[PDB]
Short mmCIF file of all heavy atoms in Angstrom, two decimals:
data_model
loop_
_atom_site.label_atom_id
_atom_site.label_comp_id
_atom_site.label_asym_id
_atom_site.label_seq_id
_atom_site.Cartn_x
_atom_site.Cartn_y
_atom_site.Cartn_z
N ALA A 57 -6.69 -6.25 0.35
CA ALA A 57 -7.78 -6.60 1.25
C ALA A 57 -7.86 -8.13 1.31
O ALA A 57 -7.75 -8.82 0.28
CB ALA A 57 -9.09 -6.03 0.74
N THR A 58 -8.04 -8.65 2.50
CA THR A 58 -8.10 -10.11 2.75
C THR A 58 -9.39 -10.60 3.10
O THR A 58 -9.75 -11.79 3.08
CB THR A 58 -6.98 -10.50 3.82
OG1 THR A 58 -7.24 -9.73 5.01
CG2 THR A 58 -5.60 -10.14 3.30
N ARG A 59 -10.33 -9.70 3.58
CA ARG A 59 -11.63 -10.15 4.01
C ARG A 59 -12.56 -10.21 2.91
O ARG A 59 -13.21 -9.24 2.42
CB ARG A 59 -12.14 -9.11 5.10
CG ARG A 59 -11.23 -9.05 6.31
CD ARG A 59 -11.54 -7.73 7.16
NE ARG A 59 -12.92 -7.58 7.45
CZ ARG A 59 -13.56 -6.39 7.54
NH1 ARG A 59 -12.91 -5.24 7.34
NH2 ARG A 59 -14.86 -6.38 7.81
N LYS A 60 -12.71 -11.44 2.28
CA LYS A 60 -13.45 -11.60 1.02
C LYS A 60 -14.68 -12.53 1.33
O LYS A 60 -14.64 -13.42 2.18
CB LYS A 60 -12.57 -12.38 0.00
CG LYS A 60 -11.22 -11.61 -0.37
CD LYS A 60 -10.76 -12.09 -1.76
CE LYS A 60 -10.61 -13.60 -1.92
NZ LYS A 60 -9.79 -13.95 -3.08
N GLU A 61 -15.75 -12.13 0.64
CA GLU A 61 -17.02 -12.88 0.74
C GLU A 61 -17.29 -13.19 -0.72
O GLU A 61 -16.59 -12.73 -1.67
CB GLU A 61 -18.13 -12.09 1.36
CG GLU A 61 -17.85 -11.58 2.76
CD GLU A 61 -19.10 -10.86 3.43
OE1 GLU A 61 -19.99 -10.28 2.73
OE2 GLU A 61 -19.13 -10.81 4.70
N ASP A 62 -18.39 -13.91 -1.01
CA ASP A 62 -18.79 -14.24 -2.35
C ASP A 62 -18.95 -12.96 -3.23
O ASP A 62 -18.45 -12.86 -4.38
CB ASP A 62 -20.11 -14.91 -2.36
CG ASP A 62 -20.06 -16.34 -1.78
OD1 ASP A 62 -18.98 -16.81 -1.28
OD2 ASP A 62 -21.14 -17.06 -1.85
N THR A 63 -19.67 -11.96 -2.69
CA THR A 63 -20.01 -10.77 -3.49
C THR A 63 -19.56 -9.47 -2.89
O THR A 63 -19.70 -8.36 -3.45
CB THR A 63 -21.49 -10.67 -3.82
OG1 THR A 63 -22.22 -10.53 -2.58
CG2 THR A 63 -22.06 -11.94 -4.50
N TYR A 64 -18.78 -9.54 -1.80
CA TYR A 64 -18.10 -8.34 -1.25
C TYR A 64 -16.66 -8.58 -0.87
O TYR A 64 -16.31 -9.66 -0.36
CB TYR A 64 -18.91 -7.77 0.00
CG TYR A 64 -20.17 -7.10 -0.42
CD1 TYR A 64 -21.36 -7.82 -0.49
CD2 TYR A 64 -20.20 -5.76 -0.72
CE1 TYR A 64 -22.58 -7.23 -0.88
CE2 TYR A 64 -21.38 -5.13 -1.15
CZ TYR A 64 -22.57 -5.88 -1.23
OH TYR A 64 -23.75 -5.30 -1.62
N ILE A 65 -15.85 -7.54 -1.04
CA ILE A 65 -14.56 -7.45 -0.48
C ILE A 65 -14.58 -6.30 0.58
O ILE A 65 -14.89 -5.17 0.20
CB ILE A 65 -13.51 -7.30 -1.48
CG1 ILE A 65 -13.32 -8.58 -2.34
CG2 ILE A 65 -12.08 -6.95 -0.85
CD1 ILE A 65 -13.00 -8.25 -3.76
N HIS A 66 -14.27 -6.64 1.77
CA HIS A 66 -14.28 -5.63 2.90
C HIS A 66 -12.81 -5.03 3.04
O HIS A 66 -11.84 -5.81 3.06
CB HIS A 66 -14.72 -6.21 4.22
CG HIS A 66 -16.16 -6.73 4.11
ND1 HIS A 66 -16.56 -7.92 3.61
CD2 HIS A 66 -17.33 -6.04 4.37
CE1 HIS A 66 -17.86 -8.05 3.58
NE2 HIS A 66 -18.37 -6.92 4.05
N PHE A 67 -12.75 -3.72 3.08
CA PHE A 67 -11.50 -3.00 3.10
C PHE A 67 -11.34 -2.31 4.51
O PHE A 67 -10.31 -2.53 5.17
CB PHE A 67 -11.48 -1.84 2.06
CG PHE A 67 -11.03 -2.34 0.74
CD1 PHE A 67 -12.01 -3.00 -0.17
CD2 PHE A 67 -9.68 -2.24 0.27
CE1 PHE A 67 -11.61 -3.49 -1.43
CE2 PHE A 67 -9.38 -2.71 -1.02
CZ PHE A 67 -10.30 -3.33 -1.84
N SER A 68 -12.41 -1.57 4.92
CA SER A 68 -12.44 -0.82 6.18
C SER A 68 -11.11 -0.10 6.43
O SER A 68 -10.36 -0.32 7.35
CB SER A 68 -12.66 -1.76 7.36
OG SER A 68 -13.81 -2.54 7.24
N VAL A 69 -10.78 0.79 5.47
CA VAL A 69 -9.56 1.59 5.46
C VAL A 69 -9.81 3.06 5.12
O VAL A 69 -10.70 3.32 4.26
CB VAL A 69 -8.51 0.91 4.61
CG1 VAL A 69 -8.84 1.09 3.12
CG2 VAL A 69 -7.09 1.57 4.86
N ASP A 70 -9.16 3.93 5.80
CA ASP A 70 -9.37 5.38 5.56
C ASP A 70 -8.29 5.85 4.53
O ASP A 70 -7.09 5.49 4.61
CB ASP A 70 -9.11 6.26 6.86
CG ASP A 70 -10.23 6.05 7.84
OD1 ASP A 70 -11.30 5.45 7.54
OD2 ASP A 70 -10.03 6.51 8.97
N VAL A 71 -8.73 6.60 3.57
CA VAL A 71 -7.91 7.24 2.60
C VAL A 71 -7.99 8.75 2.78
O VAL A 71 -9.04 9.33 2.75
CB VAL A 71 -8.23 6.82 1.10
CG1 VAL A 71 -7.30 7.51 0.13
CG2 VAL A 71 -8.13 5.26 0.97
N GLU A 72 -6.75 9.36 2.98
CA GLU A 72 -6.69 10.82 3.13
C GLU A 72 -6.44 11.52 1.88
O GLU A 72 -5.45 11.33 1.16
CB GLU A 72 -5.55 11.15 4.20
CG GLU A 72 -5.66 10.30 5.53
CD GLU A 72 -6.86 10.69 6.36
OE1 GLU A 72 -7.54 11.72 6.19
OE2 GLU A 72 -7.14 9.87 7.35
N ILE A 73 -7.44 12.40 1.47
CA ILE A 73 -7.32 13.11 0.22
C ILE A 73 -6.26 14.21 0.43
O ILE A 73 -6.34 15.09 1.29
CB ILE A 73 -8.71 13.66 -0.20
CG1 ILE A 73 -9.59 12.44 -0.48
CG2 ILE A 73 -8.60 14.51 -1.45
CD1 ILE A 73 -9.07 11.50 -1.55
N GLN A 74 -5.24 14.27 -0.49
CA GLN A 74 -4.04 14.97 -0.31
C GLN A 74 -4.14 16.41 -0.88
O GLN A 74 -3.23 16.94 -1.50
CB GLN A 74 -2.87 14.27 -0.99
CG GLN A 74 -2.58 12.93 -0.26
CD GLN A 74 -2.11 13.12 1.15
OE1 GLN A 74 -1.07 13.80 1.30
NE2 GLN A 74 -2.75 12.61 2.08
N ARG A 75 -5.29 17.03 -0.65
CA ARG A 75 -5.35 18.49 -0.84
C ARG A 75 -6.56 19.00 -0.07
O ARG A 75 -7.63 18.46 -0.07
CB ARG A 75 -5.44 18.87 -2.35
CG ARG A 75 -5.03 20.33 -2.61
CD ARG A 75 -5.39 20.76 -4.05
NE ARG A 75 -4.46 20.29 -5.02
CZ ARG A 75 -4.40 20.74 -6.25
NH1 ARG A 75 -5.15 21.71 -6.71
NH2 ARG A 75 -3.45 20.21 -7.15
N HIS A 76 -6.38 20.17 0.56
CA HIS A 76 -7.54 20.87 1.17
C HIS A 76 -8.57 21.15 0.11
O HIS A 76 -8.29 21.62 -0.98
CB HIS A 76 -7.06 22.16 1.86
CG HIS A 76 -6.07 21.94 3.00
ND1 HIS A 76 -4.73 21.79 2.86
CD2 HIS A 76 -6.35 21.75 4.33
CE1 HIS A 76 -4.13 21.56 3.97
NE2 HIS A 76 -5.13 21.47 4.91
N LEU A 77 -9.86 20.79 0.43
CA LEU A 77 -10.92 20.87 -0.51
C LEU A 77 -11.15 22.15 -1.32
O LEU A 77 -11.31 22.17 -2.49
CB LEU A 77 -12.28 20.42 0.14
CG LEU A 77 -12.38 19.01 0.74
CD1 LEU A 77 -13.76 18.75 1.31
CD2 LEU A 77 -12.02 17.97 -0.35
#
Side-chain angles (χ1 to χ4, degrees):
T58 54
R59 301 158 53 211
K60 305 202 306 197
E61 303 184 336
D62 291 4
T63 63
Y64 288 90
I65 290 148
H66 299 84
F67 278 82
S68 308
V69 69
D70 292 348
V71 179
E72 310 291 346
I73 296 303
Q74 296 293 302
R75 202 192 281 194
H76 298 86
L77 297 181

